[PDB]
Amino acid sequence: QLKYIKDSIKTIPDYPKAGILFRDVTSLLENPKAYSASIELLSEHYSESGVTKVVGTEARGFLFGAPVALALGVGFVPVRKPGKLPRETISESYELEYGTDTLEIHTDSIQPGDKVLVVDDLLATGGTIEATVKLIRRLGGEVVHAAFIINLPELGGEARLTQQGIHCYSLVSFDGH
Amino acid sequence: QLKYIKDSIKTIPDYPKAGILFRDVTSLLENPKAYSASIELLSEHYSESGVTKVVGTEARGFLFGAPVALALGVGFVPVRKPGKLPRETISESYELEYGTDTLEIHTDSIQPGDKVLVVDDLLATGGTIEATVKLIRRLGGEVVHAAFIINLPELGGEARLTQQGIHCYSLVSFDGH
Ligand SMILES: Nc1ncnc2[nH]cnc12
Ligand SMILES: Nc1ncnc2[nH]cnc12
Ligand code: NA
Ligand code: NA
Numbered sequence: 001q002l003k004y005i006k007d008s009i010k011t012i013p014d015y016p017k018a019g020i021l022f023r024d025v026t027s028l029l030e031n032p033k034a035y036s037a038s039i040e041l042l043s044e045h046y047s048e049s050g051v052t053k054v055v056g057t058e059a060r061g062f063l064f065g066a067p068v069a070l071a072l073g074v075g076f077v078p079v080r081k082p083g084k085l086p087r088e089t090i091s092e093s094y095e096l097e098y099g100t101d102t103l104e105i106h107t108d109s110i111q112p113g114d115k116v117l118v119v120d121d122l123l124a125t126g127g128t129i130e131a132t133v134k135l136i137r138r139l140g141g142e143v144v145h146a147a148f149i150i151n152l153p154e155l156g157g158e159a160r161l162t163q164q165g166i167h168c169y170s171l172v173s174f175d176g177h
Numbered sequence: 178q179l180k181y182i183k184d185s186i187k188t189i190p191d192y193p194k195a196g197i198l199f200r201d202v203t204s205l206l207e208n209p210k211a212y213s214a215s216i217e218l219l220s221e222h223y224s225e226s227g228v229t230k231v232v233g234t235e236a237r238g239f240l241f242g243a244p245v246a247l248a249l250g251v252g253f254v255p256v257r258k259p260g261k262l263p264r265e266t267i268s269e270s271y272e273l274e275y276g277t278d279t280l281e282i283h284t285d286s287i288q289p290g291d292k293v294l295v296v297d298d299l300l301a302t303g304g305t306i307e308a309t310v311k312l313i314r315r316l317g318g319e320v321v322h323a324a325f326i327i328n329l330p331e332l333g334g335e336a337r338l339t340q341q342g343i344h345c346y347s348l349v350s351f352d353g354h
Contacts, residue, residue, distance in 0.1 A: 010264070012263045012264060015263055016263075022263050024263045024264065026254075026255060026262065026263070026264075026283060026286070029243070029252065029253045029254070029255065030230070030252035030253060030254055030286050031252060032246070032247070032250050032251055032252050035246075035247060035252070035253065036247055036250070039247065053207070058235075058236040059235040059236035059239055059257075062236055062239040062240050062243075063239050063243050063253075063255075066206070066239075066240050066243070066244060067243060067244050067247055069209070069212075070209070070212060070213055070216065070244055073209050073213070074209055075206065075207035075208060075209050075212070076206045076207060076212065076240075077203075077206070077207055078203060078206065078240075080236075085203065086189045086192055086193075086199050086201045086203070087187070087189060087201065087203075106203060109203070109207050
């Protein structure tokens, strides 16, 4: 199963620059068996967790977070780049390689007592997830779990989230930057 | 049911400019009953359709297309703004209010014989959907169905898609621009 999921992910060499082996999750998306298995494994992993909300960042986070939310029977809450959410938001900044950006969340969608799972497609540096954790906690939400399809351990994302008290669960792992 | 879905959607007046009543689908997302019902109704509507792929545009399209794909047991194929898909793409342009943009799809993810359902959150002018239809058809895919949570009939999206031979199915409809 885990092997069938991993085999369904394609690698594109020298993209987006020479030396990087791009791990392309869209090939998993188009394989119904691998996609539904991925959602099955993520959701069952947290079935006993008392999770009350799932949060995912746009856009690829939506592809894994929302189905997990549906499978758990809990609400899904999007985290978006600025100017896309219509109600009251709070905001957190994070670093890109070449500058800064921000993420927003609806202030009403998280409240004290919420047990929140964050789901994303791939864990790289972990900067967006670290900003997302801060957003949730500022609103009185509890978050100690982040789930991914792919972990790239060499980029230090997991170590960094560990520093914030986050337990990361990933289905597969790959070498490289 | 349809009423419970519709009541779960919030309206924000004078956003993003005065006079517009913004219909905010994020309130549906965070209501597990309304969200799972929405996916149930969309999927059952096409259960007998012989659909073999579902396509959704980023990002809000992902939130409805991918769960429908999972429920139908078929592959999901993303349509994205340029420079996000890693494998070979084709491209189509469309008009925004203030300029032009393009959408891309993976050339390998659609092939002759595919029966394709397009799913999005809200039907407004229909420009992105019209570009998406062209992408699918260029790759030998058959598409005659588009599904939405919300239709804003006054913006002419449905009439425009009818001209391309698309049958639109929407769960709820709202007045206004
Ligand atoms: N190798 C890789 N594949 C996909 N996404 C990435 N982000 C950073 N490195 C990556
Ligand atoms: N009233 C409205 N609500 C949400 N999205 C829109 N796009 C165009 N008009 C809209
Ligand atoms: Na709140
Ligand atoms: Na093709």
